Amino acid sequence: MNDALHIGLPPFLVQANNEPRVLAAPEARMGYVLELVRANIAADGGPFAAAVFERDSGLLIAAGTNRVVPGRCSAAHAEILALSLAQAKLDTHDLSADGLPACELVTSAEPCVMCFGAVIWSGVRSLVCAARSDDVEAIGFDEGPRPENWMGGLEARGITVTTGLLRDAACALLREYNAC
Amino acid sequence: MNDALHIGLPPFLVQANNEPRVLAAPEARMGYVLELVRANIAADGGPFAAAVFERDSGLLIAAGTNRVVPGRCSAAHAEILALSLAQAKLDTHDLSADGLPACELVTSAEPCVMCFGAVIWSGVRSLVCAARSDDVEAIGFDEGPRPENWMGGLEARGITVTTGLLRDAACALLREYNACNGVIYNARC
Ligand SMILES: Nc1nc(=O)c2ncn([C@H]3C[C@H](O)[C@@H](CO)O3)c2[nH]1
Ligand SMILES: [Zn+2]
Ligand SMILES: [Zn+2]
Numbered sequence A: 001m002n003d004a005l006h007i008g009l010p011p012f013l014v015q016a017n018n019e020p021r022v023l024a025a026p027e028a029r030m031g032y033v034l035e036l037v038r039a040n041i042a043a044d045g046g047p048f049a050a051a052v053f054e055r056d057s058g059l060l061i062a063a064g065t066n067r068v069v070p071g072r073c074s075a076a077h078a079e080i081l082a083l084s085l086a087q088a089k090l091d092t093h094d095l096s097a098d099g100l101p102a103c104e105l106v107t108s109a110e111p112c113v114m115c116f117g118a119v120i121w122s123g124v125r126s127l128v129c130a131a132r133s134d135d136v137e138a139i140g141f142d143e144g145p146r147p148e149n150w151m152g153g154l155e156a157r158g159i160t161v162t163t164g165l166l167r168d169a170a171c172a173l174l175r176e177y178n179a180c
Numbered sequence B: 001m002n003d004a005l006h007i008g009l010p011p012f013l014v015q016a017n018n019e020p021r022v023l024a025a026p027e028a029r030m031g032y033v034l035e036l037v038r039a040n041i042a043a044d045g046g047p048f049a050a051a052v053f054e055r056d057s058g059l060l061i062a063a064g065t066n067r068v069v070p071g072r073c074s075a076a077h078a079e080i081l082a083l084s085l086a087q088a089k090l091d092t093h094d095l096s097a098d099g100l101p102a103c104e105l106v107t108s109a110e111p112c113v114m115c116f117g118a119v120i121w122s123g124v125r126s127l128v129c130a131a132r133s134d135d136v137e138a139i140g141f142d143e144g145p146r147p148e149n150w151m152g153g154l155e156a157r158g159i160t161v162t163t164g165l166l167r168d169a170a171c172a173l174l175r176e177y178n179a180c181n182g183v184i185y186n187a188r189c
Helices: A011-016 A026-042 A077-087 A113-122 A133-137 A150-155 A168-178 B011-018 B026-042 B077-091 B113-122 B132-137 B148-155 B167-180
Strands: A004-008 A049-054 A062-065 A103-109 A124-131 A161-162 B003-008 B049-052 B059-064 B102-107 B128-129 B160-162
Touching: A004 B077, A011 A026, A011 A062, A026 A049, A026 A062, A026 A103, A026 A124, A026 A168, A049 A077, A049 B049, A062 A077, A077 A103, A077 A113, A077 B003, A077 B132, A103 A133, A103 A168, A113 A150, A113 B113, A113 B160, A124 A168, A133 A168, A133 B160, A150 B102, A150 B160, B011 B026, B011 B059, B026 B049, B026 B059, B026 B113, B026 B128, B059 B077, B059 B102, B077 B102, B077 B113, B102 B113, B102 B132, B113 B148, B148 B160
Parallel strands: A103 A124, A124 A161, B102 B128, B128 B160
Antiparallel strands: A004 B003, A049 A062, A049 A103, B049 B059, B049 B102
């Protein structure tokens, strides 16, 4: 781009970031995130997606997917895209800015060490994961050197963590990606 | 864009990325990354800069700076920008892809935990830092929860780590940023 770092997004993902969605139940939020996984694989991306929602309402704020290969950008993990697009939409770099509602990142899989970092600086107050890190390793993705007790590390910084939500459904999509 | 991840580059950073530049010595590369720190603080960004070089020729591939506040993006650390812009120019996610020259990330401070992870994924083979984690913490920033022995973890993944290079000057700049970052107007800022 020359005068910007610009990561374009495939049509289904631009649509996800510009369509109204309020999904109140945690599993509804995760189900939608898993639909973005499948759309992403069809759009040449990795089998990972994530979306930022208002924690209480379930209003979708932004979504992201793994666009590393087609985007030529190793930082383009789903969590980075979802967090950055939510910040852009809300016009702030910090999702816990006074007066903003609490934000939650709903992710198809436990975060790698980069995304662990990004979650901490983002301002989100909640993280909900579907596939576990052993599930992601089992299809050839590396979580990298996260610290021991990364979940506790998040909790100590005010981010409550849920894991294993619709895990089996997320794993079916991981195993599919791997098989092809 | 709500249609894309888009972090615009200030003009001095477009300039840095446009102009061919070869810096052979570690100190030369770092001296230049420290010019960008000072330019970035003047262009409303954080006191941090980084650049990707060809390790064995010193050719500059891309530079980045902290644009967290001006770019409304908490992901927009120097290292993230430099890595990603380098990737974009060379048209690969992997700086270690076949046929590419080995790359080195030269950075004004030790990476926070996010950037540490970015460095592992990026395909650079060397990381060279100026200010230490304690330096940046001393002006109130926080590197976050890096794993124990993060430097050894890099070397275990084949990424050579050097720290402390022009640390005194990089520390001078952090203090200068610190001294200017308050709300009470002060003319000499
Ligand atoms: N190396 C490096 N480059 C950057 O651009 C940068 N920006 C911030 N930091 C450190 C301190 C903050 O608490 C935390 C910022 O949220 O991480 C950085 N470290
Ligand atoms: Zn990640
Ligand atoms: Zn960082």
